[PDB]
Amino acid sequence: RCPDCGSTELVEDSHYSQSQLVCSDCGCVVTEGVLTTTFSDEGNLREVTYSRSTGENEQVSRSQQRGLRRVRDLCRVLQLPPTFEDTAVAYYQQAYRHSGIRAARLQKKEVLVGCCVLITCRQHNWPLTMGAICTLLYADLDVFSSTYMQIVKLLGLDVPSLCLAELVKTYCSSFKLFQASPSVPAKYVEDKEKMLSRTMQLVELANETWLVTGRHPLPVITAATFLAWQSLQPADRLSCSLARFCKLANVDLPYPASSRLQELLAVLLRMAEQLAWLRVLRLDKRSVVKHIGDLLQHRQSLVRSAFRDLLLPPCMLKSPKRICPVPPVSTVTGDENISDSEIEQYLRTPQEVRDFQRAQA
Amino acid sequence: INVEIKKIMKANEKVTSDADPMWYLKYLNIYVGLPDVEESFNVTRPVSPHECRLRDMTYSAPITVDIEYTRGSQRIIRNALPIGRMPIMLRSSNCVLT
Amino acid sequence: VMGPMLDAATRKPIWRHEILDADGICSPGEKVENKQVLVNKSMPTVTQQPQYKDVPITYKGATDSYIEKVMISSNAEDAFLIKMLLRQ
Amino acid sequence: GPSGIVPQLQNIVSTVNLGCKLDLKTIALRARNAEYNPKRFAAVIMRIREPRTTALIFSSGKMVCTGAKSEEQSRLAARKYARVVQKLGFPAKFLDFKIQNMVGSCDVKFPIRLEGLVLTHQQFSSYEPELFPGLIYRMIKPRIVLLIFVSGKVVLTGAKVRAEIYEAFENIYPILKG
Amino acid sequence: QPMIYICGECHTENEIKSRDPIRCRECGYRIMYKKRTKRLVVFDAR
Amino acid sequence: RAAQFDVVKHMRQDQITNGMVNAISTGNWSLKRFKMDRQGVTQVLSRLS
Ligand SMILES: [Zn+2]
Numbered sequence A: 001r002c003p004d005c006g007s008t009e010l011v012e013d014s015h016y017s018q019s020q021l022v023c024s025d026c027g028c029v030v031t032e033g034v035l036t037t038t039f040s041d042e043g044n045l046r047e048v049t050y051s052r053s054t055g056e057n058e059q060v061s062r063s064q065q066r067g068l069r070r071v072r073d074l075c076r077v078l079q080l081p082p083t084f085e086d087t088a089v090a091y092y093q094q095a096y097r098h099s100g101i102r103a104a105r106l107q108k109k110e111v112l113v114g115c116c117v118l119i120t121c122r123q124h125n126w127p128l129t130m131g132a133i134c135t136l137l138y139a140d141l142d143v144f145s146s147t148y149m150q151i152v153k154l155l156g157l158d159v160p161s162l163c164l165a166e167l168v169k170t171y172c173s174s175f176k177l178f179q180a181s182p183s184v185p186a187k188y189v190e191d192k193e194k195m196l197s198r199t200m201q202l203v204e205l206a207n208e209t210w211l212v213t214g215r216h217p218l219p220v221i222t223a224a225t226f227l228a229w230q231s232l233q234p235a236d237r238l239s240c241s242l243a244r245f246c247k248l249a250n251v252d253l254p255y256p257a258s259s260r261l262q263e264l265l266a267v268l269l270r271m272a273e274q275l276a277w278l279r280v281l282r283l284d285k286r287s288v289v290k291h292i293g294d295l296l297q298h299r300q301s302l303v304r305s306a307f308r309d310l311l312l313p314p315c316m317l318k319s320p321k322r323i324c325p326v327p328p329v330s331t332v333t334g335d336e337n338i339s340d341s342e343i344e345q346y347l348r349t350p351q352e353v354r355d356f357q358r359a360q361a
Numbered sequence B: 001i002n003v004e005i006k007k008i009m010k011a012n013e014k015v016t017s018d019a020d021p022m023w024y025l026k027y028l029n030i031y032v033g034l035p036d037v038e039e040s041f042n043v044t045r046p047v048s049p050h051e052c053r054l055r056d057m058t059y060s061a062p063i064t065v066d067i068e069y070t071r072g073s074q075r076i077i078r079n080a081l082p083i084g085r086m087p088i089m090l091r092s093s094n095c096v097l098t
Numbered sequence C: 001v002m003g004p005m006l007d008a009a010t011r012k013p014i015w016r017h018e019i020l021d022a023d024g025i026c027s028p029g030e031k032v033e034n035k036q037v038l039v040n041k042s043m044p045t046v047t048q049q050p051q052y053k054d055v056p057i058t059y060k061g062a063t064d065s066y067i068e069k070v071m072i073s074s075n076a077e078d079a080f081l082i083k084m085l086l087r088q
Numbered sequence D: 001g002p003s004g005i006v007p008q009l010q011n012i013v014s015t016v017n018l019g020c021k022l023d024l025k026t027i028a029l030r031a032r033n034a035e036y037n038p039k040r041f042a043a044v045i046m047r048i049r050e051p052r053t054t055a056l057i058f059s060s061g062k063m064v065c066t067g068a069k070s071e072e073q074s075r076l077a078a079r080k081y082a083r084v085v086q087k088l089g090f091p092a093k094f095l096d097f098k099i100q101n102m103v104g105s106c107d108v109k110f111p112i113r114l115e116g117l118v119l120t121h122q123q124f125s126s127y128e129p130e131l132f133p134g135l136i137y138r139m140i141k142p143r144i145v146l147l148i149f150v151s152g153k154v155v156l157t158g159a160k161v162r163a164e165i166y167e168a169f170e171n172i173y174p175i176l177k178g
Numbered sequence E: 001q002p003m004i005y006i007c008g009e010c011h012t013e014n015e016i017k018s019r020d021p022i023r024c025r026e027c028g029y030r031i032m033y034k035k036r037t038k039r040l041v042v043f044d045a046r
Numbered sequence F: 001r002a003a004q005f006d007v008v009k010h011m012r013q014d015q016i017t018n019g020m021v022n023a024i025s026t027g028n029w030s031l032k033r034f035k036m037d038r039q040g041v042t043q044v045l046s047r048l049s
C-alpha cells in the first residue's frame, strides 16, 4: 500500500536504468535501487550440493554408496539421458528409507536397482523389455520379478504401461534386413518404412482381436514382422520358415512364436472369409499371405463384421455345455461326532510301533 | 581417423588382470561409422549439419569396436560393441557433405 | 506457458501481452516494442498443489523490431526449445 | 442386479489352540498319519477327506487347518483332528477357534478387456501382462484382493465370511459390465 | 480451434495443443514453425 | 563373487564422449601424461562476412 495515499495500486517500474516501486495513483516512490552481482564475480561461481552442505552424503553406508554407484553404471552404460539417472538414484535413495530393504541380501538389492531403473524408464514412456535389464544384471528372472512386485506393492507408485507402438518402433530397427550385408543375400533387403507401416498395422489388427491381452508381446511383434516380410515379396520369401528368418536376422525367437503365428493365421482366415475374391478363390494358410494389403486396406468394417459371428481363448472355446457346475451343499457338521471309526484308523498298534526305529537309522 | 586411430588401438591391444591369471581381453578392430542422432527410443536416424545447428546438438558419429574376452570359457566374441562418439569435421571422409 | 491474460475492461490483452498469440508466444510478423513479453513462461516453486511464479522473457532494446520467424523443437529429455528471429 | 451366478467358495483357512505341549516325534511314531522331516522342517501335517482338508501341527500346541469349502466344515475337520490328538494320548482341547481366510471364484460370461480397466482404475488395479497373465485389483471395502481375467472368471480372497465375498462380487459387477 | 504449426520439412499443418513431444504427423521431422499473424501491420514507404 | 564376472557389464561410454566434447568446446587441453595444459586452442567461427 502506498504510504502517501493508501491506495494499493503499486506498480513495479524502471526508468531508463533505475528500478523502483511507484504508486501508480500519486507518483510516490516507496523503494528504489538494487544491488546485483556482476560478471567479475560471475566467473567465480562454484557449486555445493545442499545435501553436502547439510552434512548428508556422510551417513551413506559403504553398501549404499556401492549400490548407487551400481545404479549410475547401469544407467550410463545404456547411454540414457542424465535426468533418467538422477531420477533413478533419487528413487533408490527414497526406497532405502524403509528398514525392510536396507536389511536385505545382495541379489535383492541388485534386482531392486534394476527395477528402479526400469520404473524410472517407464515414467518417461521409454520402451524397454525387462529381459534386457535382467541380462545386464547378475540375477535370474524369477527373483527379479518377485522383488519388483514386492517393491511396487510397498511403494504403490505409478507404473505406466508399455505402449505397444513404442515397443514396435524400438524392436523393428534391431533387425539387420535393412542393409545389404554380405552375410545376407540382397534378395531380402527392403525399405524399412514400408516394413514399419505393415508391421504396426498388423500388430494393431492383433491387438484389437484380443490376441495381445494377457500374453507376451514380443512373439506377437515377431510374428507380425514375419507376415510383413513375406507379404512384401511372396515370390521367393514364402518358402522360408521361422528358423531361417531368425538365423539371418540373428535373433532368438521365443518358443511361443509358432503358436502365436498359428492363431494369427486362424484370425486372417476368419478375416478372409468375408471378402468376395478370397472366399471364392478358396485360399489356405500359406497362400493367404499375398493379399495382406488387400485385407488391411479395408480392415475395420470387415473385422466389425467378423465380430458379429469376438475372440476368446481356444481352450475354453471348445463349446463347454456345462459352465461352473454348482457343487452339492455339504455344510452340515453333525451334532458332535458324525463317526468314531475314523479315529479307529489314525493309530498304530504296538506290533509295528516297536520296530519303528531300525530302517531309517 | 583413417590410420592413427588403428595405430593407437594396436599400441594398446591387450589388457590382463594381475589377479587371477589366464583372464584377459583383446581388441581387434575399431571403426568410426557415420553421424547420427540418439532420439528417445533407443533407435537412431541420420542427421545433417544444419539440423545440429538448429537443435543445439553435436555433430558426431559413434565409435564401434569388436572384442574378444573370456568368462569361464574363452569363446566369447562381440562384433559391433560401441565405446563412445567422436565429433566429425565438416567435408571430411565420413561427413554427409562429401 | 500461459495464454495472454485479458483485460477486465476492454476484452483485449493487457499492453505487456499485446503481441502474444493464444498460446503464449509471439506471432510472426508483428512489431515488438521495449518491455513487451516474448514468452509467458512460468516456473514451479519446488526448486498441496505446487505454486508457480512468472519469469516471462521480456524484449530488451531501445528500438522496435519485427518478429520474422519462430521455431519450436524438443530434445530427447523433453526439454522444449524455442527460438525467435528479430529484424531491424 | 445379480447375473444369476453366485460366487462359490473354494477354500477355508482356520486355526485353533490345542492348549498343551506335544512331541512331534511321538506323533510321527504313533499316529497312522504324520510327517516329521526336521531336516527340512520340524512339523506334522494332517489331512482328511470328510471334510476335505489339510491341517498342520506343532510342538507348541497350535493347529492350522485349511481346505474345506465351508467354514463350518473347516471347524468340523478341526474338531476331528482334536479328537485324533486326544486319542493319540495328548490332553488336547479345542480352544480359541479362529477363521483366517477363504478363497472363492465366479464368472460373468463375457470377455474382459483389461486395458480399459487399467486405464480407468490404475490407482487400485495393477496390470502387468508380462509375468502374471491376469489383472490384480485390491479392494478396500472389505479388505479383499481380486484377480480378473479376460475369460470373465474372477478369484476372490482375503475375506472372513461368504457375505464379504458376495458383497465384493456385487460391488465389482457393475464395473465389470462397464 | 487448436493451433497449427507448420512442419519444417514437408510443410503439412500439424496441431499439438498438448505436451505431446514434437514430431511431424507424416514425415519424421522434428522442427516446427509458427504460422504468420492474422492482424494487419502498417508500414511507411520511406 | 565366486562365479566369473564378464567385463561387458561395466563398459562405460561417457568418459570418451564427454572428454572429447568438453576438450573441443572449452578449448583447453589438459594432459597428465606430459604435464601440459594448453589454453585457447579453439575459437568460435566468425560470420561477419
Ligand atoms: Zn499513492
Ligand SMILES: [Zn+2]
Residues within 6 Å of the ligand: E007, E008, E009, E010, E011, E012, E024, E025, E026, E027, E028, E029
Ligand atoms: Zn513433416
